[PDB]
Design a protein around this motif. Structure first.
Motif, short mmCIF file in Angstrom:
data_model
loop_
_atom_site.label_atom_id
_atom_site.label_comp_id
_atom_site.label_asym_id
_atom_site.label_seq_id
_atom_site.Cartn_x
_atom_site.Cartn_y
_atom_site.Cartn_z
N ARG A 1 15.95 4.87 -1.11
CA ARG A 1 15.06 5.42 -1.91
C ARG A 1 15.29 4.42 -3.62
O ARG A 1 14.86 5.04 -4.39
CB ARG A 1 15.03 6.91 -2.49
N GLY A 2 15.16 3.28 -3.24
CA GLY A 2 15.13 2.37 -4.30
C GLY A 2 13.53 2.04 -4.61
O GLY A 2 12.84 2.87 -3.97
N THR A 3 13.55 1.01 -5.68
CA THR A 3 11.92 0.94 -5.97
C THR A 3 10.99 0.21 -5.15
O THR A 3 9.91 -0.04 -5.20
CB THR A 3 11.88 0.23 -7.39
N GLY A 4 11.54 -0.41 -4.06
CA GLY A 4 11.07 -1.19 -2.97
C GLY A 4 11.08 -2.75 -3.11
O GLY A 4 10.74 -3.43 -2.22
N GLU A 5 11.56 -3.26 -4.37
CA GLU A 5 11.52 -4.84 -4.69
C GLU A 5 12.35 -5.47 -3.74
O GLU A 5 12.17 -6.39 -3.10
CB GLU A 5 11.91 -4.90 -6.00
N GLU B 1 1.02 -1.13 0.03
CA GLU B 1 -0.18 0.13 -0.06
C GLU B 1 1.06 1.44 0.04
O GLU B 1 0.56 2.35 -0.75
CB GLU B 1 -0.94 -0.07 1.13
N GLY B 2 1.97 1.22 0.74
CA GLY B 2 2.77 2.55 0.83
C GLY B 2 3.51 2.66 -0.50
O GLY B 2 3.55 3.68 -1.12
N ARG B 3 3.98 1.51 -1.44
CA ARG B 3 4.60 1.72 -2.66
C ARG B 3 3.28 2.39 -3.59
O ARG B 3 3.94 3.19 -4.36
CB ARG B 3 4.92 0.34 -3.30
N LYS B 4 2.26 1.80 -3.57
CA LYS B 4 1.23 2.41 -4.53
C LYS B 4 1.29 4.05 -4.29
O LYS B 4 1.04 4.76 -5.01
CB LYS B 4 -0.14 1.89 -4.12
N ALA B 5 1.33 4.24 -2.76
CA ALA B 5 0.72 5.65 -2.42
C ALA B 5 1.96 6.43 -2.57
O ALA B 5 1.75 7.80 -2.90
CB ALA B 5 0.08 5.73 -1.07
N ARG B 6 3.17 6.00 -2.56
CA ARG B 6 4.51 6.86 -2.59
C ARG B 6 4.49 7.94 -1.52
O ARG B 6 4.67 8.99 -1.83
CB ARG B 6 4.43 7.74 -4.00
N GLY B 7 3.98 7.60 -0.39
CA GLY B 7 4.18 8.43 0.93
C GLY B 7 5.46 8.37 1.36
O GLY B 7 6.54 8.03 0.99
N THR B 8 5.54 9.24 2.91
CA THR B 8 6.93 9.48 3.18
C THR B 8 7.26 8.30 3.96
O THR B 8 8.49 8.04 4.46
CB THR B 8 6.85 10.73 4.18
N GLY B 9 6.65 7.46 4.15
CA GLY B 9 6.92 6.17 5.11
C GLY B 9 6.42 6.01 6.26
O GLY B 9 6.50 4.94 6.90
N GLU B 10 6.15 7.00 6.91
CA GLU B 10 5.78 6.91 8.16
C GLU B 10 4.61 6.17 8.80
O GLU B 10 4.77 5.43 9.82
CB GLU B 10 5.41 8.33 8.75
N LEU B 11 3.58 6.13 8.02
CA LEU B 11 2.46 5.40 8.17
C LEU B 11 2.83 3.68 8.32
O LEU B 11 2.28 3.02 9.07
CB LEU B 11 1.28 5.58 7.14
N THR B 12 3.67 3.47 7.19
CA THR B 12 4.22 2.06 6.95
C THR B 12 4.86 1.72 8.44
O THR B 12 4.61 0.63 8.70
CB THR B 12 4.95 1.84 5.75
N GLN B 13 5.88 2.64 8.65
CA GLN B 13 6.71 2.27 9.87
C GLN B 13 5.78 2.06 11.16
O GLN B 13 5.99 1.27 12.01
CB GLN B 13 7.82 3.16 10.24
N1 LIG Z 1 9.87 1.59 -2.81
C1 LIG Z 1 9.29 2.15 -2.16
C2 LIG Z 1 8.40 2.93 -1.16
C3 LIG Z 1 8.18 4.31 -1.42
N2 LIG Z 1 7.20 4.98 -0.63
C4 LIG Z 1 6.89 4.32 0.48
N3 LIG Z 1 5.94 5.09 1.15
C5 LIG Z 1 4.99 4.64 2.22
O1 LIG Z 1 4.89 3.84 2.82
N4 LIG Z 1 4.39 5.83 2.53
S1 LIG Z 1 3.38 6.02 3.82
O2 LIG Z 1 3.80 5.28 5.05
O3 LIG Z 1 2.91 7.44 4.02
C6 LIG Z 1 1.62 5.26 3.17
C7 LIG Z 1 0.72 6.11 2.65
C8 LIG Z 1 -0.28 5.49 2.16
C9 LIG Z 1 -0.63 4.09 2.49
C10 LIG Z 1 0.36 3.34 3.42
O4 LIG Z 1 -0.03 2.06 3.59
C11 LIG Z 1 -0.09 1.62 4.86
F1 LIG Z 1 -0.23 0.67 4.93
F2 LIG Z 1 1.10 1.83 5.65
C12 LIG Z 1 1.57 3.89 3.67
C13 LIG Z 1 6.68 2.74 0.32
N5 LIG Z 1 7.54 2.17 -0.29
#
Ligand SMILES: N#Cc1cnc(NC(=O)NS(=O)(=O)c2cccc(OC(F)F)c2)cn1
Ligand SMILES: N#Cc1cnc(NC(=O)NS(=O)(=O)c2cccc(OC(F)F)c2)cn1
Ligand SMILES: N#Cc1cnc(NC(=O)NS(=O)(=O)c2cccc(OC(F)F)c2)cn1
Ligand SMILES: N#Cc1cnc(NC(=O)NS(=O)(=O)c2cccc(OC(F)F)c2)cn1
Lengths: 317, 319, 317, 318
Positions: free
Chosen positions: C17-21, A12-24
């Motif tokens: 900041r790679g593609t995530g794979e 979900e984070g990869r699709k959204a391209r967010g900052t990663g905080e929500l994923t962590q």
């Molecule tokens: N390669 C790569 C890559 C690049 N950016 C990433 N960004 C995030 O995960 N961004 S987010 O945490 O803001 C986020 C936003 C929306 C949904 C979401 O899902 C929830 F399940 F956590 C998490 C992740 N992987």
């Protein structure tokens, strides 16, 4: 094709391209839930009883420490703490998290199902974080969910993309996706409430219940289930359909459950599953809170059952 | 001084100087319960979902209990909720005990992760005949031992014998049942009633009046709280721990109740009475009913003695 | 401040900041290692023995399926399969993975430590994926590591940032970081090889071992350890220092161990830990392979001990 | 027909019709082994590393000590971890003496090497009040002996008069499952096991015996060599695959390295019930009469043909 909680969240984070905080953040919560589940199941109980010569406090410490170490949070509101916890600057991120670390633990003496509830909001301003930043309506939730420590441990997670259910495999400590994009039944056959407060019910409630026991359209009366643990009663409502009610009574004229870390996340899960969640006068998610520990009356579940209750409620003005 | 189920069961046998069959019986039962808990908690579910590229739970549970009891060499007749006829143990594996059990009670609603449980009662074979289904048609009074395992937030085994009721918590880290509550006794009077009120239109009038008294007390005391999980083991254990009353009574649509006498009502009734509680059908003690069919039903009202006695007064007032 | 494999892996990816794979690949491998560990410890064996009325094949299936489902791989080379496995087009990603799913399992009957070894390459050409894409020198490794299923389960992970060791907490199924940026001793006190084949040794090997047992000066002879499982002997060399040898001889001029999924990953771990790994003639990581199952002689460990070994090897060359 | 350690041990007692103390002892020992295994596998380590904001061999010692004392079956305890013998208090006293190493091999647990627990059980022989003297019995007087190996899986090996039986721990359900009944060692193996780093200190007999394993005079295949460094692991491999295990005397250890009471005697008892052999060179291990509870001994053990081949070389060297 197998899918795990970790893989799901990262995708979900990869699709959204967010900052990663929500994923962590969600990964941190995942770890705490597995550690709460292991203690709820009493792993290590033999050491307490002298083989070699608290539980709600430990759950709060687990969630608190895991959330702080995520670097994703700035304000933490727990059912266990009087005031909001402000994360120190070095660990601070942008998310506000409200949680009940072990709801229903009053009755864990009898091994009732218990659970963990959480809601995640984004802090909107650049001001210094404060307790006020947690006074947001439910409509602002970015994500919410619960873990149920029942006969098995299950994590239910709701986001915009829908509601997904993960079962904990204790053999390998992994959450496995077992129910994708869950939707609640349009109408159920179970109502859930503590009928012992019957002398104190509002007349709309008393009449609504009477319709469940003596249906006006000559259908089968509903069955009643009331575990007394909020996570269990709501999860059964999600899985089977039906209705859950905790209305006002005389000990709780504004209801008993807490809006920020019980009612709102459950309403977010309900609505994302195509169900409904109302106070009687408005949607749970639209109440604007003024105190982090304020209460709310709650009716939620299958939409036909909640609409049926709102018709009785409106008929009573 | 720590005490385990294995040690406790063995010490009871040493005191009595019996043949040892009952001790092996409980050892087999303990192993089956630990295996049910591991499967009820979904250990291995990742394999069902394709992590490397299948029996329903109540089928697996019955297979665990049946196989462990036969392999104990202590049983001759087995009655399960899952089989129409009694299972007669083959001769080389035969012992002297008859066991009635519900391997996974409440599994109809396990889809929602509700508490489930295992219930068992143990009798001694009474006749000199070939073992037969007749041998399980005994009243609850004849029970040698009974108990239940509850798979709730944690797994607990409750074991009742002549010496009383003892509660064992499973430490999943080391697979041991730890004695945590010795000689348990139910509260004299509780503040919780438990029954399915959605079926209120079908209640006997005595039940209707008693429920009204719990919600609208005539002396201006506190109304009772209500709980109804829907899983018998869960509701009975709550009643055992907190006090109060559990009802699955007779009505006009169900004159003999819904629950099964041999492997639900009787073992729960034996545990209640050994813990200082009461268990009645309305007309008599549950343990005094003599069954005629191994799957016959019975109404049951049980719990704290004051709550149950007050119920019998309403039932009798309805002559 | 607690740190888990999931958190570690995600943070390294955020920094880069790679593609995530690669992050999804490492998460999949983590799940596979926990499942292998649970099976290696014999969870469920009571069902095999009839309570209710191979192992390396299962390990290979867990790794294959977790890696394929990651969407990060296109060629998989396993010690268990004769040919390279080509991932199907809809699941194809950019990484090539070589692995031994259960190293040392020839002797698992005696409950000796066993292990998993893996090495990760990036696919270099745009040609259709094939066995050729795995024929890269170890120098091209993106990451490598091993899991040891000993008295406890540990994951050792090597990347450009260094070597990090994670202990599996089986109570909650989490890998906990316990040894950060590990480095091997400059010189050890243990030598490790099968001395039963002394009659077949190359003469340089015979003299090197004799100096370890009968030191020409006034120091202590080395101790000898040989478990027979590569992962365990290499992990001990990593932790205590010393030297591990599986050298070439006249009946086995290329050694016995396999280059792609044993020698290269272990050599990569050694070098990132400041150790050394030689064939006798060149660095293991510099050998360009021509067959996916080709063997290589390997001497690895503390740099002083390896350099002393090369000194004797040149004297006999 | 599935069988557990609990079921096995109870059926052995029913056959024998004893006082029941030994059955309660093995039940305690079983519980302690499951608890040690749980700690060896690092269950709960995340709490040590701050997930919420005893040394392994000390905990192991407290588990065995506490489980054995509470069994009411023991009166004297000798542990590798305690300088003096432990005398059980009178209210808990039974008739058995138990010698054990709670966590053998823990010097090298830093590298996750296999570790183990070893125990040996004697009946107290004299009528005096319990004291350290009661553990100074030869291995011949053992009633039971065994070891737990915490390897790739956890296994308990138990030897009694009826023989040697191996139980695998199913960690999902905390049960020991019988998987190998009445185990017997190969008459002759193909693996030798010893620390060859002490080659400069070997007596001539060990040097010649080893030389024969690498350069066989009959121009047959050389033996393979294995040395884990943990006695329980090396002995279990010898039992399962055959071969020979040696820890002879050296200059650092002129009376050998391993301890007689809680390492050599139990392992020798298992070897002998599986049809193998165990000698110091001068006598059978089980025939040595100890004078101190922590005294050391040299040990050669394993397949009977391989040990006899060693004794023949040993005799050739006077
Ligand atoms: N390669 C790569 C890559 C690049 N950016 C990433 N960004 C995030 O995960 N961004 S987010 O945490 O803001 C986020 C936003 C929306 C949904 C979401 O899902 C929830 F399940 F956590 C998490 C992740 N992987
Ligand atoms: N917000 C956000 C965000 C943004 N970018 C991300 N990118 C990746 O993870 N990229 S990567 O998988 O190519 C990668 C490259 C290097 C090291 C690495 O280490 C890990 F495997 F240990 C993983 C992730 N999250
Ligand atoms: N019914 C019944 C009944 C009656 N007597 C019993 N007596 C014992 O168990 N006795 S014993 O413990 O001294 C013992 C003696 C020999 C071997 C043995 O092996 C065991 F440790 F594995 C244990 C047991 N059950
Ligand atoms: N030494 C020795 C020795 C001697 N006699 C023994 N006798 C039995 O175990 N007898 S019994 O199994 O019939 C039994 C009878 C009463 C209670 C009981 O409770 C248990 F199942 F909880 C079991 C055992 N060990």
């Amino acid at each position: 094709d197998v899918n795990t909680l970790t893989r799901f969240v990262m995708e979900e984070g990869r699709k959204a391209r967010g900052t990663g905080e929500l994923t962590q953040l969600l990964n941190s919560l995942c770890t705490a839930v597995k550690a709460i589940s292991s203690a709820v199941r009493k792993a290590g109980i033999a050491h307490l009883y002298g083989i070699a010569g608290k539980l709600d406090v430990l759950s709060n410490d687990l969630v608190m420490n895991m959330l702080k170490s995520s670097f994703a949070t700035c304000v933490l509101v727990s059912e266990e703490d009087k005031h909001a916890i402000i994360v120190e600057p070095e660990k601070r991120g942008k998310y506000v998290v409200c949680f009940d670390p072990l709801d229903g633990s009053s009755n864990i003496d009898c091994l009732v199902s218990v659970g963990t509830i959480f809601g995640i909001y984004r802090k909107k301003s650049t001001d210094e974080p404060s307790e006020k930043d947690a006074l947001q309506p439910g409509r602002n939730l970015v994500a919410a969910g619960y873990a149920l420590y029942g006969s098995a441990t299950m994590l239910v997670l709701a986001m915009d993309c829908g509601v997904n259910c993960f079962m904990l495999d204790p053999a390998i400590g992994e959450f496995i996706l077992v129910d994708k994009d869950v939707k609640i039944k349009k109408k159920g056959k179970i109502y859930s409430l503590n009928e012992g407060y019957a002398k104190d019910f509002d007349p709309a409630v008393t009449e609504y219940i009477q319709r469940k026991k003596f249906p006006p359209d000559n259908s089968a009366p509903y069955g009643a289930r009331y575990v007394g643990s909020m996570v269990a009663d709501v999860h059964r409502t999600l899985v089977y359909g039906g209705i859950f009610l905790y209305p006002a009574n005389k000990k709780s004229p504004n209801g008993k459950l807490r809006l920020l870390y019980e009612c709102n996340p459950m309403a977010y899960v309900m609505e994302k599953a195509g169900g409904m969640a109302t106070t009687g006068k408005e949607a749970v998610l639209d109440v604007i809170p003024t105190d982090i520990h304020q209460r709310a009356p709650v009716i939620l579940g299958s939409p036909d059952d909640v609409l049926e209750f709102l018709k009785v409620y409106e008929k009573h003005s």
